[PDB]
Structures are given as C-alpha cells and as structure tokens.
Design a protein around this ligand. Sequence first.
Ligand SMILES: [Zn+2]
Ligand SMILES: [Zn+2]
Ligand SMILES: [Zn+2]
Ligand SMILES: [Zn+2]
Lengths: 422, 422
Amino acid sequence: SHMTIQKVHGREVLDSRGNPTVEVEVTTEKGVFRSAVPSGASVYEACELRDGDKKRYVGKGCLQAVKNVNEVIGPALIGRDELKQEELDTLMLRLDGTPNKGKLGANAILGCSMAISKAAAAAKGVPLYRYLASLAGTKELRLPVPCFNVINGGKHAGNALPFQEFMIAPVKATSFSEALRMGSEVYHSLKGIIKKKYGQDAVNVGDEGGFAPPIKDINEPLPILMEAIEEAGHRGKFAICMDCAASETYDEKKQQYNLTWVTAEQLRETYCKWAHDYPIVSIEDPYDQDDFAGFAGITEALKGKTQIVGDDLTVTNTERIKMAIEKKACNSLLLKINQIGTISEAIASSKLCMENGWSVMVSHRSGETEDTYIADLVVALGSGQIKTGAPCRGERTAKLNQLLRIEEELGAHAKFGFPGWS
Amino acid sequence: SHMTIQKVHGREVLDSRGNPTVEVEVTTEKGVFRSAVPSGASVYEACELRDGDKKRYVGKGCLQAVKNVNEVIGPALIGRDELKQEELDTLMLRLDGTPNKGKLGANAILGCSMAISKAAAAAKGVPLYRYLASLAGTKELRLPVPCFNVINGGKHAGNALPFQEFMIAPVKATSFSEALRMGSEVYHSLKGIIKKKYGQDAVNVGDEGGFAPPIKDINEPLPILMEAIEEAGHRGKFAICMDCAASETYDEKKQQYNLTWVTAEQLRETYCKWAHDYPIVSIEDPYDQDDFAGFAGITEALKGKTQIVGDDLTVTNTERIKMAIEKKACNSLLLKINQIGTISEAIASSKLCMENGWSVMVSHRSGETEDTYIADLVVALGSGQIKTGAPCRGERTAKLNQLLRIEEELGAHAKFGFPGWS
Ligand SMILES: [Zn+2]
Ligand SMILES: [Zn+2]
Ligand SMILES: [Zn+2]
Ligand SMILES: [Zn+2]
C-alpha cells in the first residue's frame, strides 16, 4: 500500500574525529528520515564492519557496510510497514544470521533500525521520544541529568593521570535548562582554573569536549572540580561521575593496576576514600572487564551512595548483562546502541536492567556525529541519566540542544533528573 | 490563505563552545524549519545582542534576542508568504530601523531570515541550495574546495606563533568526496607528525578542530603541512590558505607588528617568500583592518598567484565592501552571514563582489552549531570556496557531511572546486 517504506539509502559520512561511519535514510510518503551510527574506536561488542583498505581513510572506510545497506537490507525493506519495529529489527537480525552481526555489520543494521523508528514515529504523528517510550512501555518520561565530561586521563591524555573520564553533573537542578546552564558555567570556570594552574596551551579539548590538562598528580582532579563548581556559583548543586576504565591498566599476568603498582582491594580503597570525601555518585568500570568478584564487591560496598556503571563489563551485551545481573556485578548499565545493533535489543536490555533494580545511563561514543537520536532515546526510557560529553563540540551539544527542545515541548510539568540524585 | 507562515518561535541553545546563541523555527503547512545563528566571540559587524546578565552564562545569555523573535518579529511574520525573501528580509530591516540591527539584534533577525528561506524552499519543492541559487541568480552550482583549519597561532594558541589560522585545501581533487577524504587523511598524518615532534598532550584541538601545537618558531608550520601532505600520499594535490589576522599584532601608536618587531613592507616580505616557496593560494587579513594602502599593495603584488581575503577588513559590511572594491584592497570576500544580518544582504554582497572579479569564501564562526545552512549557501552561490574548519568536531563535520549529501544529489556531472586553483 500507501504509507509504506519507499527507499532505503546509505552513505559514508565523517564522525567528529574525521573517521568515516554509516548514515542511513529511510524515505516514506511523509519524508526522508536519516540516522548516523556512532563509533567508539576500540570483543563482546556487535561487529563494526570496516573496509580495511589502507588506500582510503587508512583502512577505516565503511563502503562495505554502506553497500550492505544499499544492496541487502534496503531492498528487503522496500514496501514494508515501518510501524513494526521489532518485526523489522528481527528481520535484519535474521538477514545477518550471526550472533554478532558479523555478516552485514552492526554499523549497517543500526542505521536502518534507527531510521525505521523515525519514519514510524512520523507515520504515527508523534515525536521520536514519544514513539520510543510507548515502544519501551515507559510509564513516565523525564529529562536526564547530563553527566558532562570535563577532565581526561589514561589512554585519553598524554597525562600522568591513569583513569579515563571525570564528569560533573547538576543533580540538584530543577530542569534541563538550568542543568545545561549550570554545566556550562562550571565548564567555563574550569577552563579558567586550568588555564591558571597549567597554562593557555592546556585548555584545548579532547574527543569529548573536556580538558586534558597536564595533571601530574592523582589526587588533583577531584579538588579542581569542586573548586570550579564553587567558583561558578553552584556549590552543593553538583555530583561527580567517574569512568575508570580500569582494564586499561590491568594485567592479570600480574593481576596489577599500574597507576607504580596497585591492586584491587588496594584500589577499592582509593575509590571508597573518594566516595566518602567527594560527592561521587557514580563510578564506571572501577575494575577490569572480567574481575566480576571485584565488581560486585565494590557494588554492595558503595551501595546507596555510589552506583557502579558497567561498560567494558556489560558491553551492552545480552549474555554479558545477564551474567552481571546474576552476580550483582554492578547496578548501572551504560547503554551504547551501536554496541548491540538494533533499537529493539537496546530497549530490551534497558528494560531487563531496570526490572532488576538497575539504573540506565544512555551514552554517546568517542566518535559521534550531528545525530541526536540518543537524546530522544534517554527521554523515552525515562532513565534520567545520559552522557553525551562536555557542553562543548557540536556532536555533543547537538544532543544537549535536542534535550532542550524535548523539555520545552513537554512543558513546565516535565520531570527532570535522576530521583536518587536529587 | 493556506501555504502561509503559521508559527515563529525562538529559543536559547548552546553553540560549539558552550555559549548560548539563537535558534529560530518557522512552521508552515509543510513543516517546521529551524536555523541557528553562529557566533564569533569578537565594530563594523551587525549587532549581536547579549543579555549582559552575569547571573546567566556570564552575561552571554541571548534571552533578549530570543524575546525579540517571539514578541516582535514572529507576530509580524504570521500569515506572510515565505516565498518573498527580499520582502520579508526588508520588513525585518525596517522593523529594526537601525543601520546595524542594534534594536532587534542581528542574531534575532538572522535566524528568521534563514528559517524563512528554508520554509520557502520546501514550499517550492526544491532543496535549500537550489532555492538560494535561483534567489542569487547563480548560473552554475558547484561543490566548494574545503579549506581545512589545521594549525593555530596568535590569540588562538598559547603559542609562540603570531598568525591565526593555517589551512590545507585539496584543490586538485576532482570531487568533494575525494576532497573530504584527502583532507581527512592529511589531518590524520598531521596528528601523528605533531604528536612525534611535540608530544601526545599536543594533539588536543582548538575551537575549529585544528591543532595548536607548542610551535616555538615561525617558519615551522608551513613545512610541517607539506610533510603531512606528502606522508598522507597526496603530494602536489593540495594548496595552503592562511588567515593572518594581522590586526591582532598591530599598533599604530607604533605602526608595528610584534611577531620582536616588524613592519608592513617588512611583512609583505615574509608573505612573498612564503607564497613563492609554498603553494599558498590564499592569504586572509595580511594587514590591519585599516591599512588599506598595505592591503591593495599586497593584492596586486601576489595577484594571479595568491588571493587576498578580506575579513576584519570587509567585515561582510556593505559600506566596507565598496571601499575595498574601489581601492582594490583585496580580491576575495570572506562571507559570514551573521556579520551582516539577512540572507538577501549576504547574497547581495556576494554578487557585488563577484561582479567586480572577486572570489567569495563562505565561512563559519568560531562558535558554530549543528546548523548546516552555509553548506547549501556556498553551493548556491557557486563560489567554490568555503571554510568550515578541520574535518574534526561535529559543528564542522555537520557542514562537510551536508556538502557530501548535496554532491550525491547533484550527480556525477556536478562541478567541483575553484577553477582558479584546479
Ligand atoms: Zn571517554
Ligand atoms: Zn567507559
Ligand atoms: Zn580562526
Ligand atoms: Zn579571519
């Protein structure tokens, strides 16, 4: 019939770091719907298909993934009812036939899954976040507390700092508008504080908009963030979220954490000390991707005070998530749609986790685009936690602006934040 | 009647640096059309209205500008035919009544002018760039050579480098696709070259996605860019564009250029030496905003080999442009829509310049957004020269991706590049 999918086309585009990624457009009677796939540039993840042709983009081309969209998936979608998300996502999973989307590519299937949901939402006559909420059966929509990336370390910075991300979050804000503003003002106080204590050539930013100051000391980042919060004029209104990415400094051969050498229990120490002294309400990957025992041991320890977020642990993987749920290895799931492959599965994983008392933090990827899907997504799941970078760089601010638009659209009574952090 | 403007709404959003700016939406029977205003964070420019309220965004709020959209311009636009660009833009100029748009604000009028053109294009049934080309009477559309920002100096970097921007341009590319790819690959070779000669904590990027290495030497940037071009594998396919922003180091009290102290004729020297030895096909603001005599003296000197681009000289100002045209102070106009205020005037200035043999380089602003208007604009004017930053950072890549979409849409026969640089 009529209101059916008419065209499906994919193409190569650049992400925020100059690397190619996939973009898909689904055309229907109501228009053209386009979605772009994020990239993290980093085993449990769904397969991201790259050309590997050193002649183009240093082998990072996505021509094969685009081709799979234009030649295999697209033609199977022509004529189909875009309203059937689960049915269409299932078709693509079956079209691929492998557990990790290795034949067609997760970066080929995801663009389609996303664009389909956008076309279906338009067909229904409601914004994306509303269509996705009904899809996820979400009872209450809500604007998330944005966790802004402001200080980099580890593999991220040519620093003396081992841990990865240091974030600030306006938990006490009463609206996303105020939240975004506060985050912004603090980000600027920080820029000025870092320029004074490290120099002008120290405020340039990393992939996520945050700073990578030459921090040569480990108990320096937290206090500097408190000072920036203080100076911005928002003392007591923020909390802190960390992403240790502890795997990047762990080798079993030693069962060591070279920060110098420290171990787990001798690590669960630094954490507790930082979670007792600072308002750190969330720690991501405090341990290695497989140190389950250590994972669950820091989860019940900091329970009620600091959520433990799984990333290199859950890798947004179904099997991996259930292993974590069973061993209580963590209580917060970082949701990266491109690590799983489809929206039906992404939503399924969020629901499974929330059903087990877990919280969900929707996040971006190191390599983002002007795409704003996760903005509508985080609101549709009503999780109240998202991480799309510092309030700097277009691929980050595009999401923050979309959240502003969603709030305005919902009205003064729109709910804001994570109830456990307010 | 029917296909008329139904709603006009403005709001505050964040640009790529965390600072507020204006965004406008024009709703018609065919949909919602939104455009965001760029910001350069820097006398001849049209007025950018800021709140000046230190309580919000350090006085950078744009509530007054948004309010002017929602309360003065918007209501005057309800019911109007969006097809009449010049008529509607003229109305807004008259609504403001001041030569510099100081009553309503250039950042209030521009969003409206832009969104109106988008709504009119949809009403006509053609993409934005096509509607704008007919509006500008452009005879031949063409994809521009992108001039990528890769090395920062002056007020831009805590460098020992005085001059502002150093850009690379794939002039010999045969298509925008190839152009974007080459630019990207070189950008990556550069990242690796700079990391080796300056360190890991030296590849973080500036506002425009480029690098601000600790270059402590002045004849270092050019050779490093040639090396990066060479290594990427595109020897002889690139050219170089510079933005001296010579005003930032000039004080008449002295009539000096503190690079140390050098003068004009003793500056026109370094330029010539760099334009004789390197493939520098374009120099922006080689002199102070008022050193006309020096401006025209370097224009006929490097004529045929290196275009002289006016920025702090022309400030996209009508009166300023005519003074330059008369004295042959330069031959290339940097086009910044938010420096003038409306699309009719922006297009008028481009046509006036091209009619006098000048070239036109459409550009972004230090503070951009996920907006992609200038992508369709540069193509609509058929100038073949645009500058939207390095192939890094979403507010820059969003434009580069839009250009990719425009090319694909035009077809294999689509023209690419600036004929004088090919
Ligand atoms: Zn990170
Ligand atoms: Zn992580
Ligand atoms: Zn610049
Ligand atoms: Zn300039």
